[PDB]
Amino acid sequence: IIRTPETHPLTWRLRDDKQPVWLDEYRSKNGYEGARKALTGLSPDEIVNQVKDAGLKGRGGAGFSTGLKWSLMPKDESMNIRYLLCNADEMEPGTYKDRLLMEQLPHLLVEGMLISAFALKAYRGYIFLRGEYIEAAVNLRRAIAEATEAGLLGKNIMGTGFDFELFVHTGAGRYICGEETALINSLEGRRANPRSKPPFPATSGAWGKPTCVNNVETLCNVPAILANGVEWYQNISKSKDAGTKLMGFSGRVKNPGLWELPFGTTAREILEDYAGGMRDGLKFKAWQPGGAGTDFLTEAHLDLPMEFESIGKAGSRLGTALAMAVDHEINMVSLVRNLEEFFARESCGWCTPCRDGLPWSVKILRALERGEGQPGDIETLEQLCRFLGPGKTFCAHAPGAVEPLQSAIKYFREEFEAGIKQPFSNTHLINGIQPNLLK
Amino acid sequence: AFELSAAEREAIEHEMHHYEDPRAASIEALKIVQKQRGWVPDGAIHAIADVLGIPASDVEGVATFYSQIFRQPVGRHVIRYCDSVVCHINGYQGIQAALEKKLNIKPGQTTFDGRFTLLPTCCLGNCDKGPNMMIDEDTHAHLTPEAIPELLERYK
Amino acid sequence: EMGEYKRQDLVYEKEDLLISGPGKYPEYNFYRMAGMAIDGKDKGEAENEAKPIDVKSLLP
Amino acid sequence: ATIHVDGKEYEVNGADNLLEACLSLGLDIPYFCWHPALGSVGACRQCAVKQYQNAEDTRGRLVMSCMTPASDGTFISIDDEEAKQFRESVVEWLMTNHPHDCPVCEEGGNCHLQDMTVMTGHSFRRYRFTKRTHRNQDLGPFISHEMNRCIACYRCVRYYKDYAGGTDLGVYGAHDNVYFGRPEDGTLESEFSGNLVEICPTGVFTDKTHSERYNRKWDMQFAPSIC
Numbered sequence A: 001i002i003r004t005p006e007t008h009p010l011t012w013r014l015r016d017d018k019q020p021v022w023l024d025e026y027r028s029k030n031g032y033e034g035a036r037k038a039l040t041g042l043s044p045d046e047i048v049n050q051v052k053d054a055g056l057k058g059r060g061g062a063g064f065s066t067g068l069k070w071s072l073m074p075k076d077e078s079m080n081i082r083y084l085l086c087n088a089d090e091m092e093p094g095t096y097k098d099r100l101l102m103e104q105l106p107h108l109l110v111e112g113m114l115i116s117a118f119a120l121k122a123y124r125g126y127i128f129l130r131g132e133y134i135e136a137a138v139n140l141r142r143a144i145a146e147a148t149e150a151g152l153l154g155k156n157i158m159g160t161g162f163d164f165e166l167f168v169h170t171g172a173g174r175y176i177c178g179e180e181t182a183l184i185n186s187l188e189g190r191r192a193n194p195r196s197k198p199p200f201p202a203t204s205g206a207w208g209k210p211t212c213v214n215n216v217e218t219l220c221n222v223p224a225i226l227a228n229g230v231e232w233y234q235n236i237s238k239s240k241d242a243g244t245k246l247m248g249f250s251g252r253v254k255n256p257g258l259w260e261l262p263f264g265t266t267a268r269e270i271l272e273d274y275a276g277g278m279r280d281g282l283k284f285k286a287w288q289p290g291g292a293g294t295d296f297l298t299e300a301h302l303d304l305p306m307e308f309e310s311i312g313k314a315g316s317r318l319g320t321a322l323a324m325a326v327d328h329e330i331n332m333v334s335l336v337r338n339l340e341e342f343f344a345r346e347s348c349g350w351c352t353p354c355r356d357g358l359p360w361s362v363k364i365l366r367a368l369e370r371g372e373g374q375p376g377d378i379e380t381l382e383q384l385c386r387f388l389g390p391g392k393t394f395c396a397h398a399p400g401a402v403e404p405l406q407s408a409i410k411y412f413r414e415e416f417e418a419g420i421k422q423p424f425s426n427t428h429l430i431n432g433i434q435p436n437l438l439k
Numbered sequence B: 001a002f003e004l005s006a007a008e009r010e011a012i013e014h015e016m017h018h019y020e021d022p023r024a025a026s027i028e029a030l031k032i033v034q035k036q037r038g039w040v041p042d043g044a045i046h047a048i049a050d051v052l053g054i055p056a057s058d059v060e061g062v063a064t065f066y067s068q069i070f071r072q073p074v075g076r077h078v079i080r081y082c083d084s085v086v087c088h089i090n091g092y093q094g095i096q097a098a099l100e101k102k103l104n105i106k107p108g109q110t111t112f113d114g115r116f117t118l119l120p121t122c123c124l125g126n127c128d129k130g131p132n133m134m135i136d137e138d139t140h141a142h143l144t145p146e147a148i149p150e151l152l153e154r155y156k
Numbered sequence C: 001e002m003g004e005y006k007r008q009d010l011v012y013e014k015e016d017l018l019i020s021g022p023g024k025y026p027e028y029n030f031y032r033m034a035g036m037a038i039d040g041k042d043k044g045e046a047e048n049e050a051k052p053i054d055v056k057s058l059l060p
Numbered sequence D: 001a002t003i004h005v006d007g008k009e010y011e012v013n014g015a016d017n018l019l020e021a022c023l024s025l026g027l028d029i030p031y032f033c034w035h036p037a038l039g040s041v042g043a044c045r046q047c048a049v050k051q052y053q054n055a056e057d058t059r060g061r062l063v064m065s066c067m068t069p070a071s072d073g074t075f076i077s078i079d080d081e082e083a084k085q086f087r088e089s090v091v092e093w094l095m096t097n098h099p100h101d102c103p104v105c106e107e108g109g110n111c112h113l114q115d116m117t118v119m120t121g122h123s124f125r126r127y128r129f130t131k132r133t134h135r136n137q138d139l140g141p142f143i144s145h146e147m148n149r150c151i152a153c154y155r156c157v158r159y160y161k162d163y164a165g166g167t168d169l170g171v172y173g174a175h176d177n178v179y180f181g182r183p184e185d186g187t188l189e190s191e192f193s194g195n196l197v198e199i200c201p202t203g204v205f206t207d208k209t210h211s212e213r214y215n216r217k218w219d220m221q222f223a224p225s226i227c
């Protein structure tokens, strides 16, 4: 499968031996020309308007447009200290796009942060990276050094006068650090408890200064827009989401991997053609479209385009667009138990519903695994689903945690009632006291 | 009886130079101490506190908040196997059973000779090549329970 | 049969109320249910109580 | 500013949040993490009320009344069924890991968690699994520590650090293993550390001097005196 630059704006310059493309090869393969055009012939407001016209949405699953987020900066010159943050955490399970895209293409991310910092007048950028990406950290630091010695970073960048510095902040392995307010809190060396919005980070973010936090894939889509134009960027595919996306299936498939595809591509073409369908003797039962924090879907929803709006009314989220396939042999009770165990061991411990309701669901699913379920457990899980929705908890970790549970209850309720065996016992007999035998 | 070395202190100061608030270098200071020592002892919290200038309560909260910052002593190698959902579909439990019948320990304890420390960990970002397991500097993928005895014996 | 001669002798102190055995309830023990640690009962040894996990433990 | 609570009109200060505005009128809203002297953080998720967008609405939205300003013409409901069920569920979640310690606890009869449990009307237990436990520290001669009774409302750390300026108390731990205390043993060196026995809504921090010769609040004879 070939990858021309016209339909693969991110992965066309990859190498077959999975080696990192360094500064000379990247510059040979149309490197920093968009950054040069932006920093020479374009005002920062012109770049912001071009990004807004390009319709660049948030690649982190939120779907928020990048132009509107960049337009939320105050116009005051007194608040001149502005910050750019790259969310290279990627702590969500079933998400491996950032590792591939920054292990062999770090200069693309460097150029994207350079353009996004010049468009926001931010003098400092921080790549908040997870601690498990050792090779990616080494490649990113080497790329930063190569850009610094070539004059692409630091003071008086390419003779323009804009001064920008780049740093890589390696995280210490916490899933809630991917939340942008919690990313700011973890960046400041604090416990990564999230912050309450309003105020948004665009007004008071990193150390009170205005801050823009962007995903890795958005900052990699930026140089393609700034180098190959905007009207070309909107003419990649006839869909409601301009640009491409790193998409692919994983989990007991013939060819698990990552491919750059335009929006509107249905999941069956990703499964049956790119992933080669299921393995031998494995019948497809369910799939998750956007990682561990999204609603499960069945084979009926497999013939559906993978867009934000297409999956939004389908009853799930597009997310990171890295789908997971589940066959029959995996018990859904054990799968949801592992999901809730991950979400209950990676909570930040700030607010009551997530902190003191995810262990209850974990214990209920553990009892359902061993056949120790009691009448009133599925109702408790449904109550947890009802009372951990958007706005009930302090941050958005818990709605995304309870979405797979509600989807497995909606679509696979027969496997949950197979774990309820013993009657509801909560009290033991006390001799001398006749119990209140309620009805 | 904890004394910070000169190399650790100058590395902490160099990390402090990259932030306008010295509190922001607490995570990297803890990781530097953990890399130089294997684990973060009790006096290292106070040492990082009076090097940075922040109270030791914040340093202790940061150290105990993150899972990859160790506060209890470990072995010379830390086995960190992914127990998340894609490796569950790929069957990490056979790999865990192989590790348990080899090391004869439980997840969270260390061997009697202090060689390996068995630990479950979060998603390693290698879900397409699942299951995966992390030793101190290497990430191994496409795991089988039969290859675990060959994999563990090369780490002394 | 608690009739007395002097009204002051109807004030039963702690030694006049404490009996040798459990009385009408023969098996209930409150401190097996309570969460406070006492002699012979450490934290986590009470009914429906897990063992205490330290914050410095290596588990995530 | 003008608010409408349960179809009743009230006049409140426009710069106050909804929780303190409704508490000043005598209306009852359960709350843990909010204190008048410390501000609002939105932690405990106990102060939920159903806010309507305009005068004629039926859906509403569950909002944190400690985090919601009491602006002009604000239509809210306290005694809605969804809000009351959510508050009872929050109390029930706080009661899953709570020790069976009320008779042997120095905060019994003075406990904010007891009053908020009774006020939300939660008296039936269905959580049947194990309850987490914590070791107790030694905080000095004045403050007695019992971390089992904590509900993780962050009042202690907020007061002791933002208000009292103390440096040796903080929050440690993780998802449900949060520990509020010193990093080791020793006396709290703050000169205003004694207010923790009233800031803490539970029996975590207790007056050890009172706990030596202990009696309950209804058995006390008080007088308004000067120190």
Ligand SMILES: Cc1cc2nc3c(=O)[nH]c(=O)nc-3n(C[C@H](O)[C@H](O)[C@H](O)COP(=O)(O)O)c2cc1C
Pocket (backbone or CB within 6 Å): A057, A058, A059, A060, A061, A062, A063, A064, A087, A088, A089, A090, A091, A092, A175, A176, A177, A178, A179, A180, A181, A213, A214, A215, A216, A218, A395, A396, A397
């Ligand atoms: C629990 C949680 C975890 C998140 N983890 C990540 C992450 O690992 N990477 C990421 O880019 N965004 C993550 N996000 C989304 C961020 O809050 C935010 O949307 C993102 O950093 C920037 O949005 P953007 O896509 O417009 O750039 C997470 C959100 C939540 C609630």
Ligand code: SF4
Pocket (backbone or CB within 6 Å): A176, A194, A346, A347, A348, A349, A350, A351, A352, A354, A355, A393, A394, A395, A396, A397, A398
């Ligand atoms: S839902 Fe609450 S406790 Fe859970 S991660 Fe978010 S803020 Fe933290």
Ligand code: SF4
Pocket (backbone or CB within 6 Å): D149, D150, D151, D152, D153, D154, D155, D156, D157, D180, D199, D200, D201, D202, D204, D205
């Ligand atoms: S110790 Fe008390 S004040 Fe502190 S968080 Fe727990 S319940 Fe709140």
Ligand code: SF4
Pocket (backbone or CB within 6 Å): D098, D099, D100, D101, D102, D105, D106, D107, D108, D109, D111, D112, D113, D114, D149, D201, D202, D203, D204
């Ligand atoms: S803090 Fe309150 S609820 Fe907890 S044991 Fe004491 S009196 Fe009971």
Ligand code: FES
Pocket (backbone or CB within 6 Å): A093, A094, A095, B082, B083, B084, B085, B086, B087, B122, B123, B124, B125, B126, B127, B130, B131, B132
């Ligand atoms: S789920 Fe194991 S590497 Fe991602």
Ligand code: FES
Pocket (backbone or CB within 6 Å): D030, D031, D032, D033, D034, D041, D042, D043, D044, D045, D046, D047, D048, D064, D065, D066, D067
């Ligand atoms: S009082 Fe509002 S959430 Fe705690």
